[PDB]
């Protein structure tokens, strides 16, 4: 709970020394919100010339593995994306170490609700919530200061009743739907802004960081355009061309589309693997296929020209594309595609919208490479993480394009698979929630990636429910290939059709905890993200009976 300038100028005090340092980032983890944020942050540390180790952790338990493993003279610490729920002081312990303690720890995240241990009892942290959530949150204010320090018989049940009032108050907090709020990137951007620095890079990194989650809600991201577009108006690269120039060469707003891989892929397949087109226009259907060809029958566009590479489509088809869209797409309910968001330019190397550049980053995560096998495997994921780190770096644009085509590979697996599950009709409506399971198919190892099932079930929840009236229902998916039945399984929540009345707060973060608080045989919280756990097939079916009741939501 502190303005950034204070904690930053303070981390400076512990910052320079040789040999270094001692403070280090913990990149956490595979979720993209850190990546841009870390990088700008990296550059920050590189701008102030300060040595830092760089750690790409994956597993939740693996954090314990690392903190307990090698930290010695470390005078200060950074961490991301974690501890917004569970406390490390319990998880690490810690214990006092030398007021003005020997070691500082920084932790960043948008996930809610914060731990009770997070704002108060300042030891490891240095809570970073500022200035997002004040809130109040006057409930933790009573969660301690009423709790602490806690006629004698009648005031006993009275003190215990007021404490039960604080218990029943504080019980509701910390028992609640877990949700993301704000891309940390804009926090570090307004941080860098407080320090006075703004780089067109850093705003583009902000774009990619903010944009990282755009498949998930916004929600502030809707109002982030102003928090960004204004900064785009804060950048005036030139009054005018100055053609091209070969260098700078910087971004501008334009007609972006939820439609997928636009710039680098065929317009046809652009409508075709795209998520927003899927459910609305029924892509698994051949009906909606032909029906799509009706769209070009209103677009005056050849099926060939749909098979065409975006680079070669006529300048005419380019200039009129949007206007054409305005004359047609409004027919089938597709009016919400068009978005005015941001597009980077390397010019001669092409131009890429942020929304697009996101995907290939997510490509290098699953691809582009007895319990030790999966640790070695997770380790391979963390390995390919770095290729995405350099895939942020412009210096080599070439390696990025790998993952770019790879997106066509990924989606070609996904889109095909989802339909493959659709004509099978694997949906079980149940009562409280819709749920499915995947026993086998092609490329289940590609379904080991938390994100592959994340994108998958994202695409499939958009698919299964537009809505698709009525009463949108939360989702869960499962799959297995190797490991004897780890059965990677994740919790999922419905996206409104662009017209979000409420935040909606996933209850399975708590619920999966209720099952891990339940018989919890074979269940594994080894995952960082409460949305997803490892589960054995033997106990997962009863994990499903125990998932049925008690229904929490």
């Amino acid at each position: 709970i502190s303005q950034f300038s204070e904690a930053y100028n303070k981390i400076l005090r512990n910052s320079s020394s040789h040999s270094s340092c001692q403070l280090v980032i913990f990149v956490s983890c595979l979720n993209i919100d850190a990546l841009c944020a870390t990088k700008m942050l990296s550059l920050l540390f590189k701008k102030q010339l300060v040595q830092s180790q760089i750690v790409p952790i994956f597993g939740y338990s693996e954090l314990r593995r690392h903190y307990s493993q090698l930290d010695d003279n470390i005078n200060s610490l950074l961490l991301v994306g974690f501890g917004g729920v569970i406390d490390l002081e319990a998880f690490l312990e810690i214990d006092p170490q030398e007021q003005s303690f020997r070691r500082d720890i920084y932790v960043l995240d948008a996930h809610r609700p914060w731990n009770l241990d997070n704002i108060f009892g300042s030891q490891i942290i240095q809570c970073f919530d500022d200035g997002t959530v004040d809130d109040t949150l006057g409930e933790q204010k009573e969660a301690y200061y009423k709790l602490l320090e806690l006629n004698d018989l009648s005031k006993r049940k009275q003190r215990k009743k007021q404490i039960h009032e604080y218990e029943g108050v504080l019980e509701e907090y910390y028992s609640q739907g877990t949700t993301v709020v704000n891309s940390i990137s804009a926090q570090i951007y307004s941080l860098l802004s407080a320090i006075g620095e703004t780089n067109l890079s850093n705003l583009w990194l902000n774009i990619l960081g903010t944009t990282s989650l755009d498949i998930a809600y916004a929600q502030v991201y809707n109002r982030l355009y102003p928090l960004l577009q204004d900064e785009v108006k804060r950048l005036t690269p030139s009054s005018r061309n100055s053609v091209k120039t070969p260098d700078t060469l910087t971004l501008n707003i334009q007609p972006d589309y939820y439609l997928f891989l636009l710039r680098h892929s065929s317009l046809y397949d652009s409508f075709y693997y795209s998520n927003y087109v899927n459910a609305k226009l029924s892509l698994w259907n051949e009906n909606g296929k032909k029906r799509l060809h009706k769209m070009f029958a209103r677009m005056g566009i050849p099926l060939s020209t749909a098979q065409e590479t975006w680079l070669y489509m006529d300048h005419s088809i380019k200039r009129e594309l949007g206007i054409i869209f305005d004359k047609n797409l409004d027919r089938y309910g597709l009016q919400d595609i068009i978005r005015d968001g941001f597009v980077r330019t390397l010019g001669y190397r092409g131009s890429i919208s942020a929304s697009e550049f996101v995907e290939a980053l997510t490509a290098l995560l699953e691809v582009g490479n007895s319990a030790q096998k999966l640790t070695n495997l997770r380790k391979r994921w963390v390995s390919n993480f770095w290729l995405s780190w350099d895939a942020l770096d412009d210096r080599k644009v070439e390696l990025l394009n790998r993952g770019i085509q790879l997106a066509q590979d990924l989606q070609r697996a996904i889109f095909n698979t989802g339909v493959a599950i659709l004509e099978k009709k694997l949906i079980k409506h149940l009562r409280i929630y819709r749920l499915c399971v995947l026993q086998d198919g092609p490329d289940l190892d590609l379904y080991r990636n938390p994100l592959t099932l994340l994108r998958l079930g994202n695409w499939l929840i958009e698919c299964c429910a537009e809505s698709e009236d009525k009463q949108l229902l939360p989702m869960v998916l499962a799959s297995i290939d190797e490991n004897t039945d780890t059965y990677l399984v994740a919790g999922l929540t419905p996206r409104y059709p662009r017209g979000t009345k409420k935040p909606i707060l996933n209850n399975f973060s708590m619920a999966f905890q209720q099952i891990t608080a339940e018989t919890d045989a074979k269940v594994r919280i080894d995952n960082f993200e409460s949305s997803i756990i490892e589960i054995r097939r033997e106990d997962l079916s009863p994990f499903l009976e125990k998932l049925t009741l008690s229904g929490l939501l």
């Binding site: 091209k244 070969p246 260098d247 065929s266 098979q307 065409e308 590479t309 680079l311 070669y312 006529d314 300048h315 010019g347 001669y348 190397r349 092409g350 198919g441 092609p442």
Partner: protein, 602 residues
């Protein structure tokens, strides 16, 4: 044309200005190639669309009217690059390729005519080099006015203006400049889109540094432009002028050839030689399809490398590499196997004939019925020179040039004295005989010989001869039968080979480049004693097959059989990339033909 001159300035701009951070790629490329005397540049249309969309929008519109203009500037670019003035500098070629978007041949009609089309197909036969004009000048037959025409591309008859008339001009042949033109006859890919029908061939034409770039019969990609010319309504012949052409992977190869080098190959090819499993991992490269039959499976490899070919004076020269027999009961996988084998070869032709598909198995010289005069039409064996020989239905091969196979396999040649031409032309092609034996398993209780036509001599002509016998036997099946349903869906065995890719196994499009690689280095050779070992081994092979013949059994062995097993040594050795061959090295080549010796004993 000053509009075109503004376009000229536009391209000069395009070159001098363009940057990939920071060198100007085309600009470097120029002064690079001017000392190559390439006088041509290959430009990405994407660096172009990245530079200015406009010029492409008009370029994609009538490129024919611009492509030469594009050159007239870059030929000027060399003027401002090659040298300083105040020769002779040849008019440039340009070759442009792009990722583009693939189009199928059968659907090519009208429409896209006079535009750019990326597409592949495959070339059938190369036309002879045909030279065409570049510069020409003329004095008048009457007024002696001296005309100068720059003939440019892309007909156009000579202008008549200074009786004088009608057109009094004849070429000054002495002072004129020139270029070659290829006239590609190329065919659509075998796979799409034949529907029911026959594959089309659409004619295209190379020029200058584009010429002879592509072998007859290799997979290729051409971009070019779809256009038409009369060539005796209006009924003009469809064709495509060629810019630019790029080989489908690689193909490079020809000639002498290519690497180039990408150093990691030597190491990666040497590490292969340091892998004790490499010989056997090659064996595991050959049949992702076929589980088992490891014997003949080891037998395929040693052929492709090429064996000993030594030319020692006088003109005596011994062949490589050899011959192999897949004859055995149906279920051998040998056709499926062969359809692996040909795809392995860098250059080869698949023949199930008769001869393939329509090919005279040997080149059959056939008169051009127009302007008379027999010309050799080429042949499957001819085109497959320095490459694999594929044969099915060898029970049925043409009997007359069956002998030309009886010959070409050995003397590495085919002599045609027929009609006018006496030239003895090279087939160094190495045969693999896949035919099905007479009556299947019925020649096993009989004399196994004379199985092939009416003579046993064909066997002598061949080398590694192998009889594949599959009894219906237990558990060798249940594992390959287990292998089966995996093989089919979902390629549960074709995934299982991809972790062997990371663990061990070769990629096999690699295997091409491997066998292309080590066939271009000089021929491997054995040390003396493995040879004397071939002497005491064979003295007992021959001894054994006279003693085996103590029963007056007709048959089989020759002195070209020992030598046959010799070439297998330098084969298996050419695997090693070693000038020598070890004793045991040779020895598993011995155990490798040893099954064929029991094929003689059965």
């Amino acid at each position: 044309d000053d509009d075109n001159t503004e376009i000229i300035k536009s391209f000069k701009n395009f070159i001098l200005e363009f940057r990939l951070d920071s060198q100007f790629i085309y600009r470097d490329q120029l002064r690079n190639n001017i000392l190559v005397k390439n006088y041509s540049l290959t430009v990405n249309m994407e660096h172009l669309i990245g530079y200015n969309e406009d010029i492409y929008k008009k370029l994609s519109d009538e490129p024919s009217d611009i492509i030469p203009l594009f050159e007239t500037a870059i030929t000027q670019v060399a003027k401002r690059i090659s040298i300083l003035s105040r020769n002779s500098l040849p008019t440039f070629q340009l070759i442009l390729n792009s990722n583009a978007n693939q189009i199928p041949l059968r659907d090519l009609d009208s429409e896209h005519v006079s535009k750019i089309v990326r597409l592949s197909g495959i070339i059938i036969s190369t036309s002879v080099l045909s030279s065409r004009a570049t510069y020409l000048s003329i004095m008048c037959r009457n007024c002696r006015h001296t005309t100068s025409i720059t003939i440019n591309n892309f007909t156009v008859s000579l202008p008549r203006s200074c009786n004088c008339g009608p057109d009094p001009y004849i070429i000054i042949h002495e002072s004129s400049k020139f270029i070659d033109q290829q006239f590609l006859k190329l065919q659509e890919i075998p796979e799409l889109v034949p529907v029911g029908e026959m594959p089309r061939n659409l004619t295209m034409t190379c020029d200058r540094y584009l010429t002879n770039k592509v072998i007859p019969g290799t997979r290729v990609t051409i971009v070019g432009i779809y256009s038409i010319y009369n060539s005796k309504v209006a009924i003009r012949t469809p064709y495509i002028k060629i810019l630019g052409i790029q080989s489908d992977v690689e193909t490079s190869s020809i000639w002498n050839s290519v690497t180039m080098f990408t150093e990691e190959e030597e190491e990666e090819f040497l590490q292969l030689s340091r892998n004790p499993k490499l010989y056997e991992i090659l064996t595991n490269s050959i049949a992702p399809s076929i589980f088992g039959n490891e014997d003949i499976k080891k037998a395929i490899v040693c052929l492709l490398m090429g064996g000993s070919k030594k030319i020692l004076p006088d003109g005596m020269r011994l062949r490589g590499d050899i011959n192999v027999l897949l004859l055995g009961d149906p279920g051998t996988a040998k056709s499926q196997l062969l359809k692996f084998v040909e795809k392995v070869s860098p250059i080869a032709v698949y023949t199930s004939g008769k001869g393939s598909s329509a090919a005279g198995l040997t080149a059959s010289v056939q008169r051009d019925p127009m302007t008379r005069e027999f010309y050799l039409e080429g042949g499957a064996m001819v085109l497959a020179d320095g490459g694999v020989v594929c044969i099915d239905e060898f029970d049925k091969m043409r009997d007359e040039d069956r002998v030309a196979i009886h010959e070409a396999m050995e003397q590495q040649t085919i002599s045609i004295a027929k009609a006018g031409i006496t030239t003895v032309l090279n087939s160094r092609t190495s045969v693999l005989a896949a035919a099905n034996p007479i009556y299947g398993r019925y020649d096993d209780l009989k004399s196994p010989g004379d199985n092939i036509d009416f003579q046993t001599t064909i066997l002598s002509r061949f080398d590694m001869i192998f009889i594949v016998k599959d009894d219906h036997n237990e558990e060798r099946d249940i594992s390959i039968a287990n292998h089966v349903i995996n093989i089919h869906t979902g390629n549960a065995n074709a995934m299982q080979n991809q972790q062997e890719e990371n663990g061990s196994e070769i990629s096999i499009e690699k295997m091409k480049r491997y066998i292309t690689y080590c066939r271009l280095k000089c021929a491997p050779r054995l040390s003396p004693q493995a040879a004397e070992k071939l002497s005491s081994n064979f003295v007992t092979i021959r001894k054994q097959l006279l003693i085996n013949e103590l029963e007056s059994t007709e048959r089989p062995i020759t002195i070209r059989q020992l030598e046959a097993i010799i070439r297998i040594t330098e084969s298996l050795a050419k695997l090693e990339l070693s000038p020598i061959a070890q004793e045991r090295h040779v020895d598993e080549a011995i155990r490798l033909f040893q099954a064929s010796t029991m094929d003689a004993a059965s």
